[model samples]
Target: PPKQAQAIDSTHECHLCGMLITEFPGPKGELYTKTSEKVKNFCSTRDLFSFLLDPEYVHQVKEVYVHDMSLSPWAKPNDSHFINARLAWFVVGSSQTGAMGETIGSFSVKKDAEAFIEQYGGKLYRFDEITQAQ
Candidate 1:
């Protein structure tokens, strides 16, 4: 016997209403898959934020990710196309704040990132023109 190929549906459910998120709200209403492919019918930013901040719901999530296109150092001042994103990688640890060591976050804009890099020099890399490195 051969292994079966599971059928996959493109539809996504809203974390709030539990209804299918069919209509995208605006330019920001886009979700990227692990392979970097864009997907339609996603949750609104407001609802996503709510879901992220909700302790009860947050625990149910095994993984959380955010992708924003506006984060580019070369992006013009007035350019609304660029996206600045912030993500929280949850972990099980001591409740004490100081218990954790240094935390890391990613930035898309180069100027803001370069300033930090220049002050404290470190390695850098670029993928799809997006600079990223620890």
Candidate 2:
């Protein structure tokens, strides 16, 4: 409840698995597809990244977003709370995992991310550094 997008009233299904997203928690997200000009919701960053990893959806993604870490243990869907995935700082490999398991907690600024790293057990990553190798 720390300021969020107007909660979506329309139904949402996980982009990767098509599962109803509200079943899970902790930083849910969405992808804005350029082709359809539509948004696909995900239960967590885990699922969102999974959706991105899918070749079919990768090319179509125009915007990617995840809920703010300050809003966790994230419950309910709140689109207003998201920060641009590429601009936001991420705290990866945290002790607290998301819906699909292992997740990256997102913050609006690097300092916030650093603080999160200090508060939660995790490594830090810029948008570019996140990969299978890192």
Candidate 3:
């Protein structure tokens, strides 16, 4: 694992959805598996969670990353703002809809998570606490 997300461009496509990574809105994600050095990119946090929630795929993950919503705008998230997904706080069921509709909002700090809840309205969750139910 690189301990950091690899930079992506407009040409990159989502690993799960095949959507253009830079074509969507809201937070983005990147994943690394123990078996490979190539990072799996995602168009939204929801797609990342969808992949991670699967038992078979989850086990292969070595490092994970998500854009810190607090540091980036929802419409065009910057790639340099990625943070470790394992350490991020997420808000689900938020009023804000993302690329996949009803996407999870990720934040690097608890204060930011709570702030997003105050603005968009949702339940806060930690990395491991998130599930398919979200």
Candidate 4:
């Protein structure tokens, strides 16, 4: 038998709470790898909700991206300040069937929005860059 490719092992310590995110449980395709070799994890369904509900996690994420259908048609309008703007927010899913989700909020900052936009082609609009002392 041939050796199988080992899944990349990535770790993320929540900037807000400091809990280490070892396994990603969201939509499989939502994860991204940067040039610096940093793996960025994203949530497609109730993954983020689980993160938020974890009592061990106490950090407030600086940036969040959610799926927003309302801004879809206008995202790349012909004439608008947001002509190239994308709508992005965090997804909060229902606990029942786990089939439905909602966009928590929107963003206007460019950097964070661009990261999600370039990585995930959905609507990522809000962005916030915060600096904290360690």
Winner by TM-score: 3
Which is the better candidate, 1 or 4, if ranked by lDDT? 1
Candidate 2 structure quality by residue, lDDT tens digits, 6-68: 344447677677777777667777777766555777877877776676777778776777777
lDDT of 1 by residue, 1-48 (tens): 211111113365654545444333211222332342333222433344
> Which window of 10 residues has the lowest lDDT sum in candidate 1?
90-99
Error of 2 at 114 (Å): 1.8
Question: Which of the two candidates, 1 or 2, achieves a greater TM-score against the reference?
Answer: 2
Give the distance in Å from residue 57's predicted Cα in candidate 1 to where it truly belongs: 2.8
Model 3 regions lying over 4 Å from their true place: 1-3
Question: TM-scores across all candidates?
Answer: 0.32, 0.79, 0.95, 0.26
> By TM-score, is 3 or 4 better?
3
Model 1 pairs whose backbones collide: 69-83, 70-82, 70-83, 71-83, 73-109, 73-110
Candidate 3's displacement at residue 19, Å, is 0.7
Rank ordering of all candidates by lDDT, starting from the highest? 3, 2, 1, 4
Candidate 1: deviation at residue 56, Å?
1.3
Top candidate on lDDT is: 3
Order by TM-score, highest first: 3, 2, 1, 4
In model 3, the worst 10-residue window by lDDT is 1-10
Candidate scoring better on TM-score of 1 and 3? 3
